[PDB]
Amino acid sequence: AQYEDGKQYTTLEKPVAGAPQVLEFFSFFCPHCYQFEEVLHISDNVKKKLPEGVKMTKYHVNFMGGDLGKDLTQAWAVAMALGVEDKVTVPLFEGVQKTQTIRSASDIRDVFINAGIKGEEYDAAWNSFVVKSLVAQQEKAAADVQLRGVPAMFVNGKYQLNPQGMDTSNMDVFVQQYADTVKYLSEK
């Protein structure tokens, strides 16, 4: 076939019922994730090729960066609650990997403040049970597929993207192949 199990994707031997249709995992400590976001715009280009009626979910993970890694998962929960993913994703990545000015929860907080979220609103979200449940969701979803590496994408809780098995001579071609694969798996 042109799309083969083991090549552009792998199949989970343990299916995840009720899973989000497109589920993506990342970490702000994850260098390929930085590439995926800043240089490749993977999530974007995937959505651009997905059918209608498709919803797209992105979760942060705890297993990188220890204490600050977890703070970041709670911050991403806040980001999701306030609908401000698109205002903090780039400064969080750059703050962690480029400038290295993110060293504590407070530095994470400054990113939101500078991006215009109000201190009051941020702290309220940060401490809210709506956010706690959203942290639980992020952890549960990762647990459901026994996740040990990011970046990672799952389709219908059944197929996992396999970027290693795609050509990387050309960034644009890598992206369109990646996205087309998601679309194929989507219609499976």
Supply the CATH number for residue 74's domain. Answer: 3.40.30.10
Query: How many structural domains are present in the chain?
Result: 1
One-letter amino acid at 98 equals: K
- Please state how this structure was obtained: X-ray
12 token code pair:
């989970």
Range of the domain at 23: 1-188
Tally of residues, the chain: 188
One-letter amino acid at 127 equals: N
Neighbouring residues of 40: CB distance < 8 A, sequence distance ≥ 6: 171, 174, 175
Question: Which residue, 130, 78, 100, is CA-closest to 28?
Answer: 100
Asked if 88 contacts 79 with a C-beta cutoff of 8 angstroms, the reply is yes
83 token code pair:
């609908």
Measure the CA–CA gap between 131 and 29, rounded to whole angstroms: 21
Neighbouring residues of 172: CB distance < 8 A, sequence distance ≥ 6: none
Q: From residue 26, how far is each of 69, 113, 149, 161 by CA, in Å?
A: 11, 23, 9, 13
